[PDB]
Each structure stands twice: as C-alpha cells, then as structure tokens.
C-alpha cells in the first residue's frame, strides 16, 4: 500500500473516544436492526405497498439496513484505536455505504415531504400525477443520485500506512500539493446533502402549516358565530347582546379574509349593533336569529410538523458543521493542529447523533399512520 505522513498525528486519538464510540455504534446497531426490520415487515408484508408514502418509507428502512451492515466494521475499527484490518476492498464499500445512506435518506425525506404537500393541499389535482410507478422511478433515481454522490468515496478511499505511528488506516489523504482528490468534497455534503434538501423539507411542511391554519381558523370563525348566536338567544340585557354581536362582526371579517355576500352578513350585523347600542334588546335578537359540523381536526398537528422539521435539522447540523470545518482545513484556511484535534474528536460524536436519529426515522414516520401503529403493536403483543 501507500506510506504517508500525518501532519497532526495526535489529533483525535483519545482513550475515551476509543471506548465510548464503539459502545455507541453497538447501541445504534441493535436499535437500528430492531426498528428498521419491523418497519419492513409491517409495510411490505402486512400492507403490500398501496400508497406513495409507503414506497418511500420502505426504501427509507432498506437504506438504513445497508448502512447498519457496515456499522460493526467501524465499531471494531474505532475500538482498536483507528486500525483497519479488513483490506482495501472492504473500506471502499464501507465508506461508500455511509455516504450513500446520507444522500439517500435525506433525498427520500425530501420527496416524502413534497408528497405530503400535494396530498394535503392539492388532493384532487395531484392524484393522477402521484402513482405507484412514479414513486418507484423516483426511488431508483434517488439511488443513482446517491451513488453518484458517494462516487468519490469509492475512488479516493484507500488504505494508507501511516509512517508516524505505524498504524494502517483507511481515509482520504488531503495532500498539501498535487492531490487527485476534489477540493471541496465536504461542500457537496453541505449543500446537496443538507442545505438544499432541508429548504425543500422546510418549505413543504410550512405550506402544510399555512394551509391547515387557514382551514382551522375558518372553522373557529364559524364556531364563534354559532356560539355567540346562542348567547344572544339566552341573553337578558343589551350588554350581553353587544358583547356577542361585536365578536360576531370581528369573526365575520376574519372569515372573510380566508366575491359573495360576506359584506351582507357584516352589514346586517352592523345593523343589529345600531339597535343594541340604543337600549333595544329584543329587537337585536330578532335580527340575529334571521341571519343564521363534524369535521376531523387535530390541533396537535402543528406540534408534529414542528417536531419533524427540528428532528431533521438538529440531528444533522452537528455533523454538517464539523464537515464544513474539515473543508477549511483541506483548503488551507486553517492549519492549526489544535483546531484539527477538536474536529477529529467531535466527528465520531456527531456521527453517533446523525446516524442514530436517521436509523429511527423510518420508525417514527411509521407511527404517524394509525394503521401502521395497529400492526406494529400486534407483532409485539
């Protein structure tokens, strides 16, 4: 193999890392194999793939299982103080499997979020364009775009013999001069692997947020009119009628700001306000009674949309920042071996956060479906 020299040989070589990080990879392995296997068993065998979201959720669990197969290799690798005994062929597959799963899992969530924007906001107009054939062709393109993105992890990932410590490792060699590796390889994982997809994931669920808000606020406006109309019928003085009629005029304007006679209702409420203000109590109740039910509603859907976005953001944002810090060292913006140590120490920590939350994504998205939750609890019971 090749014999190279490490600029900062003591960077990232800490005993608490060589003991804790392999333990974390074991926790991710057992939980990941357990959770992602049940997702495949429930979807592919108990539901037979009947929707577009089921195709994405199936491939989201299959992609995580492929990454978990290479996880025991990295566990014993970090356990032996970064020593690679599996050869040069097994590293190119392992390093590609991690890069492949990063792009694939994030691309699937991007398309799954776009599917939710169309299924909730445009149910009738986007149904003929969202079929089973489209979901399968979308996934095979995602497999190609992820494999194309993990392509440098197959070409430039070689096994090197470090002469400083006589330790055989596999890595990218950020040569100071005459390097065949691309300059900004970590930049691709930033924009293509996080920045661009997150802005689509954030935009999709924000439009779902705004659509459900206009629909829920409209129902509360109608519920305000009906509840206040019953207050006027049960009122006994002009003060109670004045309070309910003012709340109905305000609710009519909010319901109008969601071509017809909304000004007719608002004008007739304003006519009733002219009677209740002049001490007339019985006359205002007659005009209110002359003017003027079981829809599903989940007021906790906004907490769900909030959790979905922040779970994708806070899980990847530790790994994507130190990835960007790795690029600054590669370009030559920073050459200090002190900041290279805090980057080499925090990289195993961020991977244990991003890839642990990512292996629980097919399980969390499954529990949102009421039918999926039914089959999942039957297997455990």
């Amino acid at each position: 193999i090749k014999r190279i020299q490490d600029d900062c040989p003591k960077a990232g070589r800490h005993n608490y890392i060589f003991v804790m990080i392999p333990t974390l990879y074991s926790i991710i392995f057992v939980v990941g194999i357990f959770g992602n296997s049940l997702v495949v068993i429930v979807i592919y065998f108990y539901m037979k793939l009947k929707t577009v979201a089921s195709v994405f959720l199936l491939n989201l669990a299959l992609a995580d299982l492929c990454f978990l197969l290479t996880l025991p290799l990295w566990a014993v690798y970090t356990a032996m103080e970064y020593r690679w005994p599996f050869g040069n062929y097994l590293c190119k597959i392992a390093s590609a499997s991690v890069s492949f799963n990063l792009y694939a899992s994030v691309f699937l969530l991007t398309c799954l979020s776009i599917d939710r924007y169309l299924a909730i906001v445009h149910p009738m107009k986007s149904r003929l364009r969202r079929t089973m054939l489209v979901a399968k062709v979308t996934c095979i393109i995602i497999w190609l775009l992820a494999g194309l993105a993990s392509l440098p992890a197959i070409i430039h990932r070689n096994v090197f013999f470090i002469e400083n410590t006589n330790i055989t490792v596999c890595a990218f060699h950020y040569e100071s001069q005459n390097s065949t590796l691309p300059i900004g390889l970590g930049l691709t994982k930033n924009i293509l692997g996080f920045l661009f997809p997150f802005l689509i994931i954030l935009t999709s669920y924000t439009l779902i947020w705004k659509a459900l808000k206009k629909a829920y606020d409209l129902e509360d406006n109608w519920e305000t009119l009906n509840d206040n109309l019953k207050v006027i019928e049960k009122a006994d003085n002009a003060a109670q009628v004045k309070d309910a009629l003012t709340k109905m005029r305000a609710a009519a304007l909010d319901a109008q700001k969601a071509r017809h006679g909304f000004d007719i209702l608002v004008g007739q409420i304003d006519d009733a306000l002219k009677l209740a203000n002049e001490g007339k109590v019985k006359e205002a109740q007659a005009a209110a009674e002359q003017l003027k039910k079981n829809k599903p509603r989940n007021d906790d859907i906004f907490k769900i949309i909030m959790a979905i976005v922040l779970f994708f953001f806070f899980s990847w944002i530790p790994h994507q920042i130190f990835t960007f810090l790795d690029v600054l060292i590669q370009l030559g913006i920073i050459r200090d071996c002190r900041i290279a140590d805090i980057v080499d120490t925090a990289m195993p920590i961020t991977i244990c956060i991003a890839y642990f939350n990512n292996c629980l994504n097919p399980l969390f998205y499954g529990f949102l479906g009421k039918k999926f939750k039914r089959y999942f609890l039957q297997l455990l019971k």
Partner: nanobody
Amino acid sequence: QVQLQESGGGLVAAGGSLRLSCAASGNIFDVDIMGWYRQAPGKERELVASITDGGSTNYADSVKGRFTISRDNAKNTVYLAMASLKPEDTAVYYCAAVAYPDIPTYFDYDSDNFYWGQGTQVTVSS
C-alpha cells in the same frame, strides 16, 4: 372502509342532459372533498370537477360552462349536472372522496385518505 356508490349514468343523444349522483357510506365523520374523474377509451384519466365542503368548485377547461357540480353536506352526496353533452364526453365517470379519521395525523400508508367508486358508464351518440 369508506365506500362510494354511484348512479345516474345512461345513454343519451348529443346535446342532452344527465345528473350523476354519488353518496358516501361507511364514514363516521364528514367527507372532506369529493370530485369526479372520467377516463375516455384509449386515453388517460382526467379530473372533471371537484367541490369542497365550503362550496368552492374547480372545473376542467373542456367542461367549463356546461357541467355544474354540487353537494349536500348533510347526506355526504355529490351531484354532477351534465348539460349540452358532446360525443367527446363519452367515458366512464368515477367518484372520488377524501376522508380523514378522528384526530387526523394527515398520514396514511393504507389508502392515503383517498377513496374511489365503482364507476358508471355515460355514452353520447352524435
């Protein structure tokens, strides 16, 4: 399951009139949005009209001004009043509806909260 029963189809001469009906059954809560789809022979399916629980309607450009869709939220039924029928309108008309369960998480890996009907034939001779 939320089933959809259709009725009103038949063979009529060119320029006649029909009224397609579709009532939703098997639902505990009100159906959200209902519409009509048709599939001409040898061509892909297309959306004809759709009406929401609020009353907003959306028609296609080929049936605009001729068809009139309506619904009765009490019985969860949708009526498609077809007038000035053309020989191009000869197709099988399908009824579609969107219905969410109680406390809807707006996710469904079984039916996507979307339900179809059997379909009724509508033929128009020139």
